[PDB]
Write a protein that binds this ligand. Structure first.
Ligand SMILES: NC(=O)[C@H]1CCCN(C(=O)Cc2cccnc2N)C1
Ligand SMILES: [Zn+2]
Length: 139
């Protein structure tokens, strides 16, 4: 679990969005595993606007943060799960690191701010849904 709180927006993994997230829907994209909902309170976070390929993510299944090198956002095949059929997930960045289901929502940050959230994993890999291209989050 986990979310990004920026301005009057909450960014979560689409597959973990609550009834309240869907009742206050701003934008969602199944191909990216992202959903953004509106909030009444002003959020705690800054979004990175950069091309960093290194940063640090929070791994809830270890209660720890780990440094990672990650690929540029791209279209990557993701196996079928209970939440989606087998498909290509876009804007996804992979890195070598620990992740379990439950780790989705952990933030990846670089020195400029929030880069994205954990969205996929397994086999010693961790995948992050990129948010740096969503310029409207702080416009
Ligand atoms: N389609 C998606 O974005 C995900 C939906 C939930 C299930 N998916 C995983 O990759 C979970 C996972 C498996 C094993 C270790 N770590 C993990 N985070 C795919
Ligand atoms: Zn950066």
């Amino acid at each position: 679990s986990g979310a990004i709180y920026v301005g009057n927006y909450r960014v979560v993994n689409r597959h973990l969005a609550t009834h309240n997230d869907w009742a206050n829907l701003v934008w969602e994209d199944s191909s990216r595993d992202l959903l953004v909902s509106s909030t009444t309170a002003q959020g705690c976070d800054t979004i990175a606007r950069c091309d960093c390929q290194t940063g640090v993510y929070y791994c809830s299944s270890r209660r720890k943060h780990y440094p990672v090198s990650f690929s540029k956002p791209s279209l990557i095949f993701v196996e079928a799960s209970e939440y989606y059929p087998a498909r290509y997930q876009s804007h996804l960045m992979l890195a070598v690191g620990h992740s379990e289901p439950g780790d989705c929502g952990g933030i990846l940050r670089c020195q400029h701010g929030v880069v994205g959230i954990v969205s996929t994993g397994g086999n010693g890999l961790v995948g992050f849904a990129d948010v740096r291209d969503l310029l409207w989050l702080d416009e």
